[PDB]
Enzyme design. Structure first.
Site, PDB file in Angstrom:
ATOM      1  N   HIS A  34       0.825  -1.060   0.096  1.00  0.00           N
ATOM      2  CA  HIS A  34       0.145   0.324  -0.109  1.00  0.00           C
ATOM      3  C   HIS A  34       0.872   1.348   0.062  1.00  0.00           C
ATOM      4  O   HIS A  34       0.300   2.448  -0.198  1.00  0.00           O
ATOM      5  CB  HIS A  34      -1.055  -0.004   1.334  1.00  0.00           C
ATOM      6  CG  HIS A  34      -0.361   0.154   2.371  1.00  0.00           C
ATOM      7  ND1 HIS A  34       0.290   1.352   2.795  1.00  0.00           N
ATOM      8  CD2 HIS A  34      -0.319  -0.558   3.667  1.00  0.00           C
ATOM      9  CE1 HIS A  34       0.495   1.222   4.120  1.00  0.00           C
ATOM     10  NE2 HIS A  34       0.398   0.115   4.526  1.00  0.00           N
ATOM     11  N   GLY A  87       3.503   5.860  10.169  1.00  0.00           N
ATOM     12  CA  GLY A  87       4.923   5.532   9.655  1.00  0.00           C
ATOM     13  C   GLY A  87       5.521   4.265  10.105  1.00  0.00           C
ATOM     14  O   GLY A  87       6.674   4.161   9.701  1.00  0.00           O
ATOM     15  N   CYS A 116       4.430   1.573   9.696  1.00  0.00           N
ATOM     16  CA  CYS A 116       4.064   0.339   8.509  1.00  0.00           C
ATOM     17  C   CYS A 116       5.412  -0.140   7.929  1.00  0.00           C
ATOM     18  O   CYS A 116       6.405   0.524   7.554  1.00  0.00           O
ATOM     19  CB  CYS A 116       3.053   0.666   7.401  1.00  0.00           C
ATOM     20  SG  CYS A 116       1.562   1.178   7.927  1.00  0.00           S
TER      21      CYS A 116
END
EC number: 3.4.19.12
Lengths: 302, 302
Positions: free
Chosen positions: B41, B143, B145
């Site tokens: 993503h 942030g 991920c």
């Protein structure tokens, strides 16, 4: 979201861990620049040891220092308080930026538990007010170290020496000074009565509020003098003006003044949690400092 | 002695963490050999939140659209491919700090360490468990991920989790390193809810054995139970069913402590009925379920 017991990344310290064997004892050493630090009780059953005396008999080659599968050679040995310093002929190419610091009771740090010079686990703990640490150590863990990281700088604050009869642990700073009234020999030693780190509980209640966990807040506020009367009744450390000042950032972020949150803590000390939990805990956590809470609730990196 | 929620040393993973940027999105990547793994993503825009067509989005990407930074060094992407929900960025440099590693998909109740990172930089390490509802109760900010969960076997890092998103209850959802989500979750902003969570019964029993090994017995009783009677009680407390596998798995701890598994199950039943009555087990006033049988044996015995 979320709040976890979080340690510092341990990689900078892992590259410093070595195995020190001398006689029949094997434990861990901290290899920084061209010196390996380790507990002096690795020295060669005299139960009121005379460490300097036993040390002069020792040859450099008596200290078998193992860095991975590479064996370092000791070219000198000296002693500072309860820590042995073994000068080696090779500087550790993995030596991080580092300082030796002594921490205060209530301050937190990460422990890199090691066995045979090999890191096996990392966990976060606090220096208890009775100067012990509730650690997790098995035989062979001596010389495991505690540390904090500021930016790129490792602040080494603890070296493990011994387990007390209650299962809590004692050690020194990297300059060999014990934390608390302990000695590194076989004698009857006991952890004093411990107390709860009040400022850290308050910091953790602020963490709970930041995470949306609010049921314990109340309309009330107290005084520093009134709260410390209640704290002493419940074997909580006194809360000082410096503690209030340090909690300032969390007070501003949350809208909950420290003495306002103290009225919450008092209520909880007097009334319990009534089957409810805070951040997944049915006890009041005291091993997060105000800075831990700010650092984990803002994402500071290393 | 002692029992801590303990993570694996994170250094082998620290040397793998990088920063990955597409357009306005920056998150973490895992750099192993000459491949950077990150959540797919990262190629989403603010308009592709609800129903991204990742195949369509990726085909429009060119290698120079991917900004990969390892420390101060920008890595140059020479190819890209998608495997389920993870993006694989082929780079022109093999990570010289690649550990021995392997990708393992874990089962609910399994524990692992998480290296929380921001902008490719490690922030902290903590321990988690895959909940029965396939979420993790992590500590993540924006942030984070691409942060990974892992275990270490001697020197081999088993990567088992990559962080993708936070659910409305504040728990976290992610994939294995082959890009397959744990649970029924999808990398879309469409409405998704964690199922009701349940307690990892086999882990609680292991932890009760750890308590006994560490010298605590107050919660033991003279009773045993059948497996089926235990599960009928446990289900009423939203505990996971205990299987014969779980009973088998608790065998070694049963042998070490002299307490049969179904005997310990009767203790758990009673604790469920009574609570702790102001007492704690291993410093906790709640029953802990994020230690596996394997964890307990490793921390309590070696």
């Amino acid at each position: 979201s979320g709040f976890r017991k979080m340690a510092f990344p341990s990689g900078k310290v892992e590259g410093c861990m070595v195995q020190v064997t001398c006689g029949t004892t094997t434990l861990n050493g901290l290899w920084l620049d061209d010196v390996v630090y380790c507990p002096r009780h690795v020295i060669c059953d005299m139960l009121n040891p005379n460490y300097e005396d036993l040390l002069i008999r020792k040859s450099n080659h008596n200290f078998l220092v193992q860095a991975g599968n590479v064996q370092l050679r000791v070219i000198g040995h000296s002693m500072q308080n309860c820590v042995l310093k073994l000068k080696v002929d090779t500087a550790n190419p993995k030596t991080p930026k580092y300082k030796f610091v002594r921490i205060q009771p209530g301050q937190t740090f990460s422990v890199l538990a090691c066995y045979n010079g090999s890191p096996s686990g990392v966990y976060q703990c606090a220096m208890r007010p009775n100067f012990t640490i509730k650690g997790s150590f098995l035989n062979g863990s001596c010389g495991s170290v505690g540390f904090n990281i500021d930016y790129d700088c490792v602040s080494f604050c603890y070296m493990h020496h011994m387990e007390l009869p209650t299962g809590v642990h004692a050690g020194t700073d990297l300059e060999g000074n014990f934390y608390g009234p302990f000695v590194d020999r076989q004698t009857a030693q006991a952890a004093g009565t411990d107390t709860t780190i009040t400022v850290n509980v308050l910091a953790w209640l602020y963490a709970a509020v930041i995470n949306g966990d609010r049921w314990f807040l109340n309309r009330f506020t107290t005084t520093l003098n009134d709260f410390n009367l209640v704290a002493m009744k419940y074997n909580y450390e006194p809360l000082t003006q410096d503690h209030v000042d340090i909690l300032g950032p969390l007070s501003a972020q949350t809208g909950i003044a420290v003495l306002d949150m103290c009225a919450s803590l008092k209520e909880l000390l007097q009334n319990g949690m009534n089957g409810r939990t805070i951040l997944g805990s049915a006890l009041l956590e005291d091993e997060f400092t105000p800075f831990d809470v700010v650092r984990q609730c803002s994402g500071v990196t290393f």
